[PDB]
Write an enzyme that holds these catalytic residues in place. Structure first.
Site: not given
Ligand code: GTP
Ligand code: ZN
Ligand code: GTP
Ligand code: ZN
Lengths: 433, 456
Positions: B120, B193, B196, B256-257
């Site tokens: 980028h 940094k 952000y 890293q979520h």
């Molecule tokens: N389902 C859902 N979760 C969201 C949304 N926006 C943010 N999140 C958050 O993102 C996380 C991840 O999505 P999910 O696929 O529901 O997460 P998970 O806890 O792995 O749930 P499962 O995949 O159903 O076991 C959720 O636990 C919520 O905290 C949304 O629009 N839908």
């Molecule tokens: Zn930047």
């Protein structure tokens, strides 16, 4: 399966599975692509927030309040079923918003189809109905104790009001009248909807929020008033309420009614009007709709979001050149110019069906000192801006602003003259500046 | 008499007219339609913020730091011209980002064109050049004291680094410290940094423990190895530790979520399936694809997160596959997490090799053969880097301190540890049998590679 969402305003938001199922639909996820403050982002770079996160917040708060009331006063007989229905209503009250939120129902539809009566609330009901049917939510509702026919009716009533003497509501009896004051409270303008957006808008704008919603919830109680059940604040909370109203006033003065922010809203609207004949949105059964007619078909409306701005901006069609050019003015920051402001005298309110005519009226006005350059209706924008009994145990109702599309010093001068005269012809207050 | 923008992180940001002119262009305003955290919004609803506001913030902080250094040490001879060039570089360092930010250069281009070497930053240079030319900024630069040919060179160098002793040609070695403000590779301490970390924290709901203002206020240019560098007061050491812990928290909790990264790969999958059929008009009516728009800045200007919705709202039968994946995201039927591993002690996985990884995984031979077999298209292999290019280091080591009594020279001198590369695998088939199977292929693949053994 109690899912948790991290929100910067409310912290951890716990979601009932049924709510999760309503949320995970195209009809709800659509709200991610609609800006809370519409054209406000073009003035306040922190205000990138969308309706989606606001809606989660409102659903959350609605639940907190009702649940708290139920614990403190089990004599109210608030079931878990009641809690869920109020949460859902809070979740879904904004489903009907269009591109750039209030700009859409407040200005675009009026200018495009003055004959039609439309509010985002009506939209929220239609979209909710569409969401339920399109995703088989009724069985899931039943599975968690709800009774779809009456409960769906209740939810809709919370959102839009009574659906057409007496107790007007049919979703819950009069002994639970207080439940209808949580999500949308028409009479005193104190509901969880406003709590969320005050806090959220403040957080994003950089404006100080004085109100403490949690404290208010914690000390709230249902109590007897005029032989009716209402939600009442403890007397010690009076300062907190004043802080709320001040926060509200600040937001309106500083943000919602911002001079350039409103101008930009009318420019976006102008582009939509010039694009409306040429943009196609596919609705139910392959049928094609325009920006202004997508409200008649929820399948199409589902795909109508702020994206429409960029579809116009990035277009190459020669037919969209005019619309595209206005959006480019916004990027280059060559905006319409502010002419002035006035108010309607008396209890007179300019109505939505009359918005389209106003620019012509202004150009029709005859300034006595006749001037070199004459202006036409297309050169004027007329912007109509709309807007202590809580139970215990300078506010302008309509502003009218005018902008000119020509920025030439003499045209501005001219426009001012037309404007001043128009105010005189209508017995409106006399412009200052 | 210059323009002020209200920001929730920095308060009032004062903008020089020349900056205003750079900002009010399609090339800059484009950044309003590009999400800072890409697919992170789909997990953190507070994270709706875009690159635009970040860029204003970085421009602002770049200016604060330089200006502060100039006041405290006029012997450095920092001109107003120098200040502006650094502000502009901070403003424009992110011009080159693509749809969903790091997802684009970090994953999509690698998978789509493994041949090509693209960042980028390179993009930011090209787009900056394009911005300047398309909007007649050179005359305006001249009008406010800048000397376009050398100053534009300096700005680009601040953004991307040197091209091809003293490697920089935009400013001489006696102003080497100016090159550490916007982008500092060596010790990873720059105003970029700072913005952000603060901004992402504000939107995510995570607490930020670094105090950037304090750091600026106590910062000084000082002698190190006969090199001019930006040095922190010794009293500020705690503030720095707080910065590095904030960085680590943001990465662990957000960048890293688990699901957030899955969603990034789903978006990328959709783009790959759409790439053949999407047309973006560039210069001279020439048509480009999502993956080739990087070769033409006129086209790239119109390439934003909008491309997600163009695919989603499309009716073309040729886009059905791409569209179907984006619908999976709306319905929340995501790819399934199989597991995680690291190349600890190993040579680290490179971008040009990303495309091959799914085949390698399916090629692996589990000892306990399963009922059903899986193929490469069923696997996603996600390589997560904390900072892709760089060597596993301790960044405090490259920090210079000064004592107040002898402020001209540097002092002679319990943080977290980095897993600077993670590898995750996801499966596109969600049924118990396939998931079980996929796990087995994965475990084996880790073994074949002397990667760490998967846990739970
Ligand atoms: N389902 C859902 N979760 C969201 C949304 N926006 C943010 N999140 C958050 O993102 C996380 C991840 O999505 P999910 O696929 O529901 O997460 P998970 O806890 O792995 O749930 P499962 O995949 O159903 O076991 C959720 O636990 C919520 O905290 C949304 O629009 N839908
Ligand atoms: Zn930047
Ligand atoms: N110019 C500009 N202003 C922005 C932008 N984003 C937010 N703003 C804010 O929006 C305000 C109004 O926009 P401007 O058209 O500059 O309005 P103004 O400050 O009255 O300046 P003039 O209209 O040039 O007199 C600015 O003062 C900024 O604080 C942007 O991208 N460009
Ligand atoms: Zn609302």
């Amino acid at each position: 399966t109690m899912k948790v969402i991290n929100d910067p305003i409310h912290g951890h938001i716990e979601l009932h599975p049924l709510l999760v199922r309503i949320i995970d639909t195209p009809q709800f996820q659509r709200l991610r692509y609609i800006k809370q403050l519409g054209g406000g982002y073009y003035v306040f770079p922190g205000a990138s927030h969308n309706r989606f996160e606001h809606s989660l917040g409102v659903g959350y708060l609605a639940g907190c309040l009702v649940h708290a009331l139920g614990e403190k006063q089990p004599e109210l007989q608030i079931s878990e079923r009641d809690v869920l229905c109020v949460q859902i209503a809070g979740l879904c009250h904004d489903l009907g918003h269009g591109p750039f939120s209030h700009m859409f129902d407040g200005r675009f539809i009026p200018l495009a189809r003055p004959e039609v009566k439309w509010t985002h609330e009506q939209g929220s009901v239609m979209m909710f109905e569409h969401l339920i049917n399109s995703n088989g939510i009724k069985p899931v509702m039943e599975q968690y104790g709800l009774i779809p026919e009456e409960d769906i009716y209740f939810i809709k009533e919370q959102i839009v009001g009574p659906l057409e003497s007496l107790w007007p509501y049919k979703g819950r009896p009069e002994n639970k009248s207080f439940l209808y004051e949580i999500v949308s409270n028409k009479r005193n303008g104190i509901d969880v909807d406003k709590w969320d957006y005050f806090a959220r808008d403040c957080h994003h704008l950089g404006i100080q929020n004085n109100f403490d919603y949690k404290r208010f919830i914690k000390f709230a109680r249902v109590c007897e008033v005029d032989n009716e059940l209402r939600i009442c604040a403890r007397d010690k909370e009076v300062g907190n309420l004043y802080d709320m109203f001040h926060t509200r006033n600040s937001l309106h003065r500083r943000a919602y009614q911002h001079k350039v922010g409103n101008i930009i809203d009318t420019m976006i609207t102008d582009a939509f009007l010039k694009a409306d004949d040429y943009i196609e949105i596919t609705g139910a059964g392959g049928k094609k709709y325009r920006i202004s007619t997508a409200i008649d078909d929820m399948e199409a409306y589902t795909k109508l979001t702020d994206n429409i701005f960029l579809e116009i901006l990035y277009s190459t069609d020669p037919k969209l050149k005019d619309a595209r050019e206005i959006l480019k003015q916004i990027e280059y920051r060559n905006l319409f110019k502010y002419v002035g402001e006035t108010q309607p005298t008396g209890q007179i309110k300019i109505k939505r069906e009359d918005y389209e005519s106003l620019p012509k009226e202004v150009a029709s006005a005859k300034p006595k000192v006749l001037l070199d350059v004459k202006l036409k209706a297309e050169d004027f924008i007329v912007d109509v801006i709309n807007m202590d009994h809580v139970s215990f145990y300078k506010f302008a109702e309509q502003l009218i602003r005018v902008y000119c599309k020509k920025v030439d010093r003499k045209s501005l001068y001219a426009a001012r003259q037309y404007f001043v005269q128009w105010c005189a012809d209508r017995n409106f207050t006399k412009p200052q500046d």
